[PDB]
Amino acid sequence: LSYRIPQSRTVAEQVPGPKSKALDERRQAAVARALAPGLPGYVVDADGGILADADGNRFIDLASGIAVTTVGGSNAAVAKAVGAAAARFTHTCFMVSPYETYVAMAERLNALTPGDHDKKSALFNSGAEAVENAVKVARAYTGKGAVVVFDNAYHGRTNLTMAMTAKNRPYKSGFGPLAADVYRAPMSYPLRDGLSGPEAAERAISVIESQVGAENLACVVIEPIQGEGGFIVPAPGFLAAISTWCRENDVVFIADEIQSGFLRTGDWFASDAEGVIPDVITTAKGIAGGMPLSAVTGRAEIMDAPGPGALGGTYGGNPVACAAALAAIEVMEQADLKTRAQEIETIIRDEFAQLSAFPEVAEIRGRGAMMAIELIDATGRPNAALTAAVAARAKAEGVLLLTCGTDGNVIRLLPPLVIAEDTLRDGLQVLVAALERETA
Amino acid sequence: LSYRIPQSRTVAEQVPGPKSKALDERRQAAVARALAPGLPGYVVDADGGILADADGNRFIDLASGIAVTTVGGSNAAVAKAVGAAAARFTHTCFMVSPYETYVAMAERLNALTPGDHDKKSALFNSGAEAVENAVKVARAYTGKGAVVVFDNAYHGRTNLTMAMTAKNRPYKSGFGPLAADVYRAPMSYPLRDGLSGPEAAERAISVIESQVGAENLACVVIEPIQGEGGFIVPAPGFLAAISTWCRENDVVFIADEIQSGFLRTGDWFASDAEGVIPDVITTAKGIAGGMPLSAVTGRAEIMDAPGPGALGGTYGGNPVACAAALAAIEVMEQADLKTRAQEIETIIRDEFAQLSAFPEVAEIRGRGAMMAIELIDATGRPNAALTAAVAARAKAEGVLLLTCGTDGNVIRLLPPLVIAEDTLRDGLQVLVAALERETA
Amino acid sequence: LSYRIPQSRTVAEQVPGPKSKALDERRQAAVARALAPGLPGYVVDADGGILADADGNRFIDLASGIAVTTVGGSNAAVAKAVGAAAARFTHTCFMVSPYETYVAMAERLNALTPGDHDKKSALFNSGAEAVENAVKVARAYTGKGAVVVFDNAYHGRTNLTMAMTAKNRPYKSGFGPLAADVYRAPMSYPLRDGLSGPEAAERAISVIESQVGAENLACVVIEPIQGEGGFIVPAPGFLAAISTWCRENDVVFIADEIQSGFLRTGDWFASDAEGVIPDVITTAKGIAGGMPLSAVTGRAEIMDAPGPGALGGTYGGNPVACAAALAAIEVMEQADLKTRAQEIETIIRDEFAQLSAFPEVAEIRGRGAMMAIELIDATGRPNAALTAAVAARAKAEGVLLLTCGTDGNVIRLLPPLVIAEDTLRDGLQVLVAALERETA
Amino acid sequence: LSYRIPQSRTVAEQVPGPKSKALDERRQAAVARALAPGLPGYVVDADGGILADADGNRFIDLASGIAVTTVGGSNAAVAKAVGAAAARFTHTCFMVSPYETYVAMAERLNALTPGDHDKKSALFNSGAEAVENAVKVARAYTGKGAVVVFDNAYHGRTNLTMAMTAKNRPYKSGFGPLAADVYRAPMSYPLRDGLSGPEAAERAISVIESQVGAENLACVVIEPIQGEGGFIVPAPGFLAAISTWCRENDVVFIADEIQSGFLRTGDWFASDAEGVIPDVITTAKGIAGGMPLSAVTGRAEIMDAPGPGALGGTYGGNPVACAAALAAIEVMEQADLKTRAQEIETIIRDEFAQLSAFPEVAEIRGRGAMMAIELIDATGRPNAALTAAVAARAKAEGVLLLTCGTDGNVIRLLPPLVIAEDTLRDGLQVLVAALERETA
Numbered sequence A, B, C, D: 001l002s003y004r005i006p007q008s009r010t011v012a013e014q015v016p017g018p019k020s021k022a023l024d025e026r027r028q029a030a031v032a033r034a035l036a037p038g039l040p041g042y043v044v045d046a047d048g049g050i051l052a053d054a055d056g057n058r059f060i061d062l063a064s065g066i067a068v069t070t071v072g073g074s075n076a077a078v079a080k081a082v083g084a085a086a087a088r089f090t091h092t093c094f095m096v097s098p099y100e101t102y103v104a105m106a107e108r109l110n111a112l113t114p115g116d117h118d119k120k121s122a123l124f125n126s127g128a129e130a131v132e133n134a135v136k137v138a139r140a141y142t143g144k145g146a147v148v149v150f151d152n153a154y155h156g157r158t159n160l161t162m163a164m165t166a167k168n169r170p171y172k173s174g175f176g177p178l179a180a181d182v183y184r185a186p187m188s189y190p191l192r193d194g195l196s197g198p199e200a201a202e203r204a205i206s207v208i209e210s211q212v213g214a215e216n217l218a219c220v221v222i223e224p225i226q227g228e229g230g231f232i233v234p235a236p237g238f239l240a241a242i243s244t245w246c247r248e249n250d251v252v253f254i255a256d257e258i259q260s261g262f263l264r265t266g267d268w269f270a271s272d273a274e275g276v277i278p279d280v281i282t283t284a285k286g287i288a289g290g291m292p293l294s295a296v297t298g299r300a301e302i303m304d305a306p307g308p309g310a311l312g313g314t315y316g317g318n319p320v321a322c323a324a325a326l327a328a329i330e331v332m333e334q335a336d337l338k339t340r341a342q343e344i345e346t347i348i349r350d351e352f353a354q355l356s357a358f359p360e361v362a363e364i365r366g367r368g369a370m371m372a373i374e375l376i377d378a379t380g381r382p383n384a385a386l387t388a389a390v391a392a393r394a395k396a397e398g399v400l401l402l403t404c405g406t407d408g409n410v411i412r413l414l415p416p417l418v419i420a421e422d423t424l425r426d427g428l429q430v431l432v433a434a435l436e437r438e439t440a
Ligand SMILES: Cc1ncc(COP(=O)(O)O)c(CNCCCC(=O)O)c1O
Pocket: A066, A125, A126, A127, A128, A129, A131, A154, A155, A156, A157, A223, A227, A228, A256, A257, A258, A259, A284, A285, B312, B313, B314, B315
C-alpha cells in the first residue's frame, strides 16, 4: 500500500492546538450542543490509518468514522470517481430522471449479498432510511404490521428506528411517542447468558410466539454482530435458527449489516460466517468510501411488493455517491481487503495476548476489523468509568478509540482495512499501556 | 460559451434510444419496481437548462431534480469544491471527529434564515431526517408530544414523516402502523376555500384548540408553499396568524422550507415574503447543489434542548456535501440568483399570458422559480387526466415537467435558476402547445 | 301510566338541603375531584319524570341519567326482575358457565336491530367496551387496521375511545399517548356547513379516500345523531351514502347507537329513520333500565371472525342486567314507548313555539326524546355562557337540564319516555322562562 | 353457614341435559362464536359451592365466576340489597346526580386498602376500565407517558389493556394496532427462572432503566399474584423492591388487585402479605358479590390530578352494584371469610398430599382460595394437553375447574369462600382421580 500523508502518530504538548480551539468556539456558537465531538482537533486529511488535524497532529484512526472509511478516508480511486461524476451531474432524482450508476450499484449489491435467488435493491442516503425501507417492504409483502428486534439493538435515530433501538439514553429519551407494534426478544449474549446458539434461539422464539404471534409479524430484524450494543457476537447456530423459524412462519428475516457489512468482519457480510441467507439486508457505512449512500437488498418478490412511487426520497442513490461506491467496491477486490481484514484480527489478538492477565477484561470478541474488549470492575459489574478513562487517555496519546455497549463498558476497534501494520500495532500498544495506567 | 453542453432541445424519432432502452431492462431486473423513472432516457450530463441522455437526446429541465439543482446540475464551483473535498477526506462523522465545513455551513444557515435572534443548526442527509429532527428538538424543548400538520402537506417517507404527510397513495398505503399523536388541520387553499388569510387561520386554530389543545402540542409544521400538495400558497396573513398563535401558546412553529428554501421563490426563504420568523426551519434540496445534505436551524434554546449524543446520524453534514453547499450558496450570492428567480417568474407569467383563454386553467400560482398551473374539467373538478397527458406530450417533445397536487391536477415549474431565457421560453411554449393539443 | 312517587316539581328556595350538603362534604373527602356532580341534591328515588333527593326536593328529570333510564329510573318490572335474578345468581361469567338471560338478550338485539340478514351479538358492561369490541370484530373480519370517526364524535373514555372522541377538553387532555391509526372525517352539520346529505358525504368520502384509503381501513364509525357533540342530525341521505361507500369498498359500517338506540328517537334505532342498515351496531344506556349492560350486534360473519376466547370480559352480559334488559324491552313494547317518544317530540316543539322571540336560538333539532337547542351570541358565535346560565337557572328552579356540544352551546332534552305530560310541560316552561330571563 | 340449595355433587351420565342442549343451540344461533362456554349446563342457581343447571345437575364450583363470587353466587344480604336499591333507583349517572352508596363505597375502599395516607376513589364497571383509569391518573399526575408491565401479565381486553397483557393468543391477535409507550419487564417466576426475590427485581429494574428511563415512565403496573398468567407468585422481596424503585424514581406503583383482592388470598389485598403499600390499586370481581363494579383507589394527590369531568363513564359506580358491594364487604367481615380462605388453603394442601408426588405435577402454588397446580411432561416441558384433559374429565364428573397459564398448563382453584368443607374435599378428590385417570 502507498499513502498520501505520513502514517506515524504525533501529538503536540497542548491539544487542541490554536486553530482547532478556534474552530471548537465557532462550533459552540453555531451548532446544537447535542453534537459534542470527541476528537480534540479539526480534521483536514483522513488517509490510510491517520487523521491529520488543522494544527499538524496525526491521530491513529481505529474508528474509520464508525466503520465507514473501510477503504481509507480519501482513497484515490474514490476521490477521482467523485470529482469526475460531480463534473457530469450531482443529482437528477432517480425516480424522475434515471442514470446508470444507480442501476450498476443495485446490480453490485444483488451480486455480492448472500444467496443465489433473484434479488432487487433500492438505494437511500442514511442507515436509518435503509432500515425504515426494509420494514416498509416487509409490511407491503406480508400484509402484517409487527416488527421484532432484540435486546442491545441499534437501528438509527428516526421515530421508528428509535423504537427499534434498545437504549433509552441518549437515543430515545424525550423524543416519544414512538412507532407502535415493535416487540423486543432476548439476544444471544454468551458472556452474560452462557447459552448455546440453539438454546438462545429457542428462548427468543418462545417470546416471539407467546407475545407477538407469526400471524401479526412482518419481520424479525437483527444485526449479525450488534454494533452500538457492544460488538455482541451471537453463539454459533443462533442466527440460522432465527432464519429457519422466519421461513417456516412466513416472516421476513432482515439482517442489519449497516455496521457489519462490506468486508468489515473478513467476509463480504457477517451473515456469510454462518452461511445465513437473509430475505432482506440493509447496508450503508463502508458501501461508498464515506459518501452518503445506503441500500436495501432482498428477494425480488419482497422488494417488488410496494407499488409505483411507494418507495423514494429525493437524494437516494446519489450518482456521485454511487460512483464512489463502485470505485470503493472494486478497490476492496483489487487490494484484497478481505485478506487484510483477516490479518487485522490476527494482529489485534497478537497485541492483546497479555490482556488475559487483567481482571478488568471480561472478553475480547468480534471478527476481522470489528473487534472489542468488554471491561468490568472487581465484582463483575460493567466498568463504564474505566472504559471512558482508557479512551480519553489513548486520545491524549494520539489514538482515536470509540466506546459502545448497552452498559458503556466496551472499547471497540474499527480500523480502516488499509491501515499499515506498523500504525495498527502502535495504536493497540497505546490502548494496552492506557489500560495498564488506568488500572495500576 | 456559458455552458458545458448545448442548451437546445433535441429528441430523436424513437425515445428511449437503444442505450436508454438497455438501461431500462437492467433497471427492471435489478431495482425495486416502485422506482419507475419518468424520463425515457438515462442521464449522462445535467448542465444549465438541459438533461443529456445516453442516446444523445437533450431535454429542457423544468424539474431541477425536484427543486434540488437550483445552481445547475453540474455547477463548476460545486464540482470543484466536491472533487477537492473528497481528495482530503470524504467522511469522519462530525460527532466523532469534527471539521470546518460542518461549522461554516451551520454559521451560513444561522445567518441566512429569518430573524436576528440567536440560532443554532444541526446537519443531516435527507429532508425527512431534517423534519424528524425538527420534531425531536420541539418535543425535547416543550416536553409536549403532539405534532400538528396541514391538509395537502408532504414531509417525507419515514414512519413519522409518512404520518405527517397527507396523501395515502402512494406515500403511506400498506406501511403502517404509523407514529401517533399526529393531528391534521385545514390549510389555507384560497382557490378552493375562498377564505382570507385571517379567516383560514381562525378555522385552523379552532380545530387545533378543540381537538388537540396547546397543553398537549409540541409543534405546528407547515410548508410556506406546499410543494407535493400542489404549490399551494396560503392566503396573505395565514402564516403570521399561525406563527402568532404558537408564540402565545408555548408551541414551536416549524417552517418546512425543504422545497421552498434557498432562493427558489425569489426570496432566501418563502417565510421572508410575509416576514414570518419561524422558531425552527428545515432545509435540504437546493442547499448543496445536488449533494445529500439537510439541516435544522432554530432558536438556540430549542436546538440545545437535546442532551449530548441525543441528536446524530453517521453521515449527517458530510464534508463533501458541506463543501458543495458552501460553494452553491456563494454562487447564489455572486451570480445574484435571487434576481434570476424574479426574472424567471416574469418570463413564466409572460409566456402564460394566453392561458386566460383556457377554462381548463383554474389558477397560475407560486413565486420566483416555484410556479404552477392547476387544471380543471368543465364542472370545475380536478383534471388529473389532462395534467398527465400534457406532461407526457411535453416529455415526447423533449421538455421534462413535473406534476403534483393532492388531486394530481397541478403542473409545476421548477427550472434551475441558471436556465437560459431562450431555453426557458422554448420549454414554456412546448407546455402551452401541449395544453392546446390535449384540450382538443 | 302508574307512578310510585309524586310527579310534581317541588324544590326549596335553598339547595342543596342539609342532608345533601352533608353528603357533598363526604363526597369531597372520599371521591376523586374529577367527579363533580351537577344536581344540588343526593338522589333517594328516581321514578317517572322525577328525581327525589335526600331533603325531599323533587326535580324534573330531563336527563334520564344521560339517556339511560328511558323506561324510568325504578320501573316496577325492571326492579322485580333485578331482585328476582340476584336471588338465583348475580354472576357466573357467561364464557365459563352460560345462562339463558344472556342468550335471550342476544336474540332480542338480533331481532330489534336493522336488517333481515343473519346477525349475532356479544354483551359487555359499558358503551366504551361495546365501541372497543365493535372495532375488534371489524379488524378481525377485514384484516385491516385503520378506524375512521367524525368531527364532533364521542365514543368513550378508554385509550382507543378517547382517540375516537373529537373533543380534547376534558375527555382526552393529559391521557396520551392514544391508539394510532384513527383518522377523522368532516361531519354533516347542516346549521354550520349548509350542505345536502350527498354533498357532505362526497366531502367525507374525498377525505377518507385521499388521506386513509379503503385498503388500510377496517371500519367507519358514526353516531346517527351525535350526542355529546351537540345532538347533530346529519342532512338526509348522508348516512345512506357513507353506508353505500363502506359496502362498495369492503369497509365495516359501524353505527354507534349507545345514546340514540332503544326508542330514544321514536324509532327502535336512529338508523331506522333513514332505512340505513349498519354492518355492526353498538348499544348501551337505555338497553337495561339503568343496569350496566352494553352490546355489539352485527353480520354473523363479522361477529364470528374472532376465534374462541378472543372476545370476553368478566362481567359482560351480567345475568341481573340481562334480566333488567328483558323486563325493560318488554315495558317498551307493552307501554308503547315508541308512540310516547313521538308525542314527547310534539310536546317539546309545541312548548318551543315562542323561541322565535330569541335571536340567541340558532336551531331546534333532534327526534323523539332526543331534542336540542343551539345557542349563539349577537355575532352568531357559540354562546356557552348563556347555555351554562340557562342550565344553572333551570336546576335552581328544580329542573335537571344537560348541556353538550363541541363548543358547549347546546341544551339537550333526554326525558324518560314514561314522563307525565304535565311534568314535561312544567319542565319545558321552566327552560323557556330561564331563556327569557337569561336574555331579557 | 346456611345453604339455599343442596351442596352435594350430582351429574347425569350425559351432559349437557336437554334444556341445556336446547339453550346451547340457541347460543350457537345468536351469540358470537368467540363466546364458547366451558360448563356443559345452563345455570339456574349459584349458591355456596354449587352451580345448579336447568336439567337438575349440581356441579361443584371451584371457579366462582373467575374469582368474582367470593361471598357466594346469590348471597342473601347481597340479593336483598340489590332488590331494595333497584326498587328506589337503578341509575342516575353519579357525575350528573350523586347518591350516597357511591360515596359510601369510596369511603369503604379508602379505609380497606393498604396504607394510612389520604386516599380517594373513583368507581367504574369492569376491571379493564379500572386499569385504564389507573393509567390515566398516573399520566395526569406525573405528566409522563410510558407504562411498564411484566411477562405473563393479564390486564383486560380493551386496546390499552390488551397492549398491557403479555399473551397474544387469544387476547391480542388480529386486534391491533395497540396503544404505544407500553414496555414489558421480566417477572419473578421462581419455578422457571430459579431466581431469588432480590435478583428478579434487580433484573426487572435493569431492563426498565436501560430501555424505558424513569424520566419517560408514568407507572409500573403488576398483579401481586399473576392470575391468567398461571397464578405466578413472585419470589418474596420482588414486589417490595419494585415498589421501592418507583418511590425513588417518581413513578406510580399500580397494584392490579382485580383477581387477588377482597380476601381471595387470605389477606384483604395480596399486597398485604409483603407490606407493599401501592400508590394506586385497581379492584373489581369480588368487590360487589357478582354485580358489575370496579374501582381505582390511590393517594389523594394522584386521584385528584385529573380536572373536573376528566374521568367518567355513564354507568360507573352503579347504585345497585354499590349496595351489592356494601352488603358483600359486610358479609366478608361478619362471616370472617378471611379465616374461611386460610382454612380452604389447608383443605387444598391436605387433599393434594397424594398429588405433588405425581411426576407430571411441577408445583402447587398460591395462597388462600387462590391455589394452582402446574403440569409438565417427562421432559419437563409445559403439558397443556394433560391440563385440558383433566379439566374436561373433572367437568364430566360434575366439578368445574378453570385452566390458565402463559403455556396453558395450570389448573387453578378459585372456590367461593362459602364452600362447605365436604363439597371442597369431594371436588379436590375428583381433580386427583381425573389426573390419575388421564396420566395413562
Ligand atoms: C447497525 C446499524 N444500523 C443502523 C444505523 C443507522 O445508520 P445512520 O446512517 O447513522 O442513520 C447504524 C449507525 N450506527 C452509528 C451510530 C452513531 C450515532 O449516530 O450515534 C448502525 O450501526
